[PDB]
Design a protein around this ligand. Structure first.
Ligand SMILES: COc1cc(/C=C(\C#N)C(=O)Nc2nnc(Br)s2)ccc1O
Length: 328
């Protein structure tokens, strides 16, 4: 059977927290007043929610309202508990209130309003300095939630809100997030295809916070190389082949051999043999202003097959890539 795995950091955060901290099924929601919020316009719809801009008529301030779609009360209470546990943490979206929507018959989560700059306008404009600055801001959120025993499991551009005017960033949509318990097997059907870590794509269930660091590396690669998404697979099998054409097949076999994983035999006709590539091959005249030796070394240390070998969030914040970023 598969070789077990543990996070190399924050391994026992939840074992030493009180049970109420991670036992989200027993959480008792404290409901606010549903008429406090006047919906203004629909911002978006996803598979699990619809999001609206609203006015909190009690303090005359803008908020956003996330009306959850019908899903098992455990995933709803899981998200609520995680948001309450993380509230006040650096660059974590702030849950302001929870109300019962009378039409959907589900909870509506009320969040702080972030004046989000257009995500397409954003990445086409980000300077080298901006990319380093916002990556550091994302790392603050990830180190915080990891230090709190939680993995996000859905890091991707759509879940990073940036108000570029005020240089303000928030990590949102904690609906896939989970508590990390050593030895626990987790669902591999998490994250968007282009950001799925190798552990998900080879069906290795005993993963940890380091999943988020692969996803972060995929975002970084897309930003500094101006290729969206970077690993552009047609399905979850082709996604791993795309990764293997860059990281190479010998290190993929080393990875699965370390954990006693076998590839789906359907890979026999599609995977091939591939050398590991050097990151410089992706540099060209239209992205070179975003690339530096430090950027490539940082990216290289995030994008490892072996989840145990990736930089942790705190280690990433120590990387020379961020030396140029002005610290508060
Ligand atoms: C989907 O899950 C979440 C979403 C949000 C927030 C937004 C969304 N979508 C949002 O504020 N979008 C905006 N677009 N323009 C402006 Br101006 S604000 C907050 C917490 C969540 O868990």
């Amino acid at each position: 059977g598969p070789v077990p795995s543990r996070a190399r950091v924050y391994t026992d955060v939840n074992t030493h927290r009180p049970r109420e901290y991670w036992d989200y099924e027993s959480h008792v929601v404290e409901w606010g007043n549903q008429d406090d919020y006047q919906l203004v316009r629909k911002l978006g719809r996803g598979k699990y929610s619809e999001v609206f801009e609203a006015i909190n008529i009690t303090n005359n301030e803008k908020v956003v309202v996330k009306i959850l779609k019908p899903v098992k009360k455990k995933k709803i209470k899981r998200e609520i508990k995680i948001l309450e546990n993380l509230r006040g943490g650096p660059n974590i979206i702030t849950l302001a209130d929870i109300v019962k929507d009378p039409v959907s018959r589900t909870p509506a989560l009320v969040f702080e309003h972030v004046n989000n700059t257009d995500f397409k306008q954003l990445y086409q404009t980000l300077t080298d300095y901006d990319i380093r600055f916002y990556m550091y801001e994302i790392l603050k959120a990830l180190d915080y939630c990891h230090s709190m025993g939680i993995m996000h499991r859905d890091v991707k551009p759509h879940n990073v809100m940036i108000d570029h005017e005020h240089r303000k960033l928030r990590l949102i949509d904690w609906g896939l997030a989970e508590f990390y318990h050593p030895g626990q097997e987790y669902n591999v059907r998490v994250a968007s295809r282009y950001f799925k870590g190798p552990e998900l794509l080879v069906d290795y269930q005993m993963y940890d916070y380091s999943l988020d660091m692969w996803s972060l590396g995929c975002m970084l690669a897309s930003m500094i190389f101006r290729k969206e998404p970077f690993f552009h697979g047609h399905d979850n099998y082709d996604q791993l082949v795309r990764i293997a054409k860059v990281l190479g097949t010998e290190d993929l076999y080393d990875y699965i051999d370390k954990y006693n994983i076998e590839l789906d035999p359907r890979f026999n006709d599609i995977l091939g043999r591939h050398s590991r590539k050097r990151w410089e091959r992706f540099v060209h005249s239209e992205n070179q202003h975003l690339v530096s030796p430090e950027a490539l070394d940082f990216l290289d240390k995030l994008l490892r097959y072996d989840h145990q070998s990736r930089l942790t969030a705190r280690e990433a914040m120590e990387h020379p890539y961020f030396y140029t970023v002005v610290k508060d």
